[model samples]
Target: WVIPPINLPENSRGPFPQELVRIRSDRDKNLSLRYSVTGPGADQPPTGIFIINPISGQLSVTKPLDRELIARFHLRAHAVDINGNQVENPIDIVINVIDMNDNRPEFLHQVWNGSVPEGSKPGTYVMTVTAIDADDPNALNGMLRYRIVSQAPSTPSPNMFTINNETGDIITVAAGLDREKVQQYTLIIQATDMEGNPTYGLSNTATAVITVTD
Candidate 1:
């Protein structure tokens, strides 16, 4: 008689087998009410992933759910009666995966070797483009932002450098940082995901080589 607590989300909750709730049992489907969902992914397996419909108590999710492999799923719903007798009083079901940028923001180092010393000025901090987004960093799918999409020898002006859209440092926003004219500067680093929404974010590219040394 107390059945109402199922929160399945894990990435917008739908597009798979998706139904998610309804484990009824007020004793009277003529008492054939059978529904079940056990722990670890429902129905106890090495990896079941959740599913139920023992005569239509719904609850489904056959695929596509990975809050980094398993964020929250501690199910337990049973309303048996077909003779299995246990009509109600099991309810716990709490499925919450809710996090899906689908993961794409990784630039620990694809080539970030820096060195700025030849007349380095305009706010010089040239290095720090760290990234790590396996998704769900509180939600926004691992909020990360840092830009500078292209600037090879774009000299004292194709946008020399500017990042810290949230703090990956890399500053030098225009001051003609000349190693003679531009000994080296190849930043194409872009690690975005919502916070750097270049139209709904999810980008990953790296390669910053600044060796304007004196």
Candidate 2:
């Protein structure tokens, strides 16, 4: 009756009726057994999502699950003799839904404003840009990384600003950030998931307007 919790991937697209786990009784070899499961996903609301093979003790899922909506389920599996007498104690079955990288990183604001004094030293912090992802934040699917995609009026240097990939802090990286020369800078900041892996991660852009002050 001691079973480890099962981790089921979210948004599963099965061929239909895929076997999950099998529940068995020690008395199965000597007597006919009937299996049944009761819980939210089995016999209650969200019912029919899970089914059990009464004779085989095979548990199966019929459809996909959304982990964002519901993360886990607790079910009880019962084993009984063919004559309706309990053969084994009902055991607890826990199913945890694993998250998928189905959502893109999104910024709370379309535009972020900041200011940096002219002639500021390198590494001077200007501002921070943040984003949110719908996926599990503890997982790679929701780990966000930041970078400056493009900076307009690259006068003093093409790379005048650098962003902290972990913290999203934008800082000055070069001299000659004169207010009279550039006045303001329009930066396209990109937020990417999967720790900024462009090939596999989802990315979204936001605007950052940094004004140069004397």
Candidate 3:
């Protein structure tokens, strides 16, 4: 059935106490539903971030929350009959925590710049791009991270350059950065809001152009 989407504030910060989000059903008159969430922080049992009252149709968070920790949550509501048989189709709920700007832009490499010779070594330093975060750089959210998502030449090494965790710099940690080996290396650089790892972190991308010099 059709249900109006839930709307939240543009920017929400914590310590946000538990709250109620109303869900309206269009099909059944006496509809009872179960609610659950999936994604990132949801792997844990009982799902700690938030809770819902199936009978009351209220969605509430259990503890104080940080937008930086979780930008959004994907939830589902399933309606059932009195006998516990599934009744209505599940409804999708998108919960966006809203950004607080609590996170800083982080760089993956501290010192990331590479150079390649005209045509000598099969592998040389083509270039390195790093990332830096302004937030309390020491903290997970404040720490900047870098990842080379894509490179022109997918063969050899899918990821030609390596990144330094502490520093937001890209380096030829690998031996493939060679001007003679490869004239120009195009890299897709990723910067994330979380410490590292993209699966569970908020991220952004940029292109890095590395020119090989003679």
Top model by TM-score, which number?
A: 2
Instruction: Write out the backbone clash pairs for model 1.
Output: 10-97, 10-98
What tens digits encode model 2's per-residue C-alpha lDDT throughout 1-214?
A: 3768888899998865979888877888888789999999889978678788998998888899887777798888888876888888888988888788988899988999998988899999888888888888798789999999999988977799999887888998999898888999988999999888887889999988988988
Query: Model 3 over residues 171-204: C-alpha lDDT tens digits?
Result: 5544444555667766777777666656555666
Off by over 4 Å in 1: 1-22, 25-28, 36-46, 49-66, 70-96, 100-105, 108-110, 113-132, 136-138, 147-160, 164-172, 180-207, 212-214
Clashes of 1: 2
TM-score of each: 0.38, 0.84, 0.42
lDDT of each: 0.75, 0.87, 0.56
Candidate 2 similarity to native, TM-score:
0.84
Q: How should the candidates be ordered by lDDT, best one leading? A: 2, 1, 3
Q: Which ten residues in a row have the lowest lDDT in candidate 1?
A: 1-10
Poorest 10 consecutive residues by lDDT, candidate 2? 1-10
Instruction: Please say which candidate is ahead in lDDT: 1 or 3.
Output: 1
- Estimate the Cα RMSD of every predicted model relative to the unseen true structure: 10.8, 2.6, 12.4
CA lDDT, candidate 2, residue 115: 84
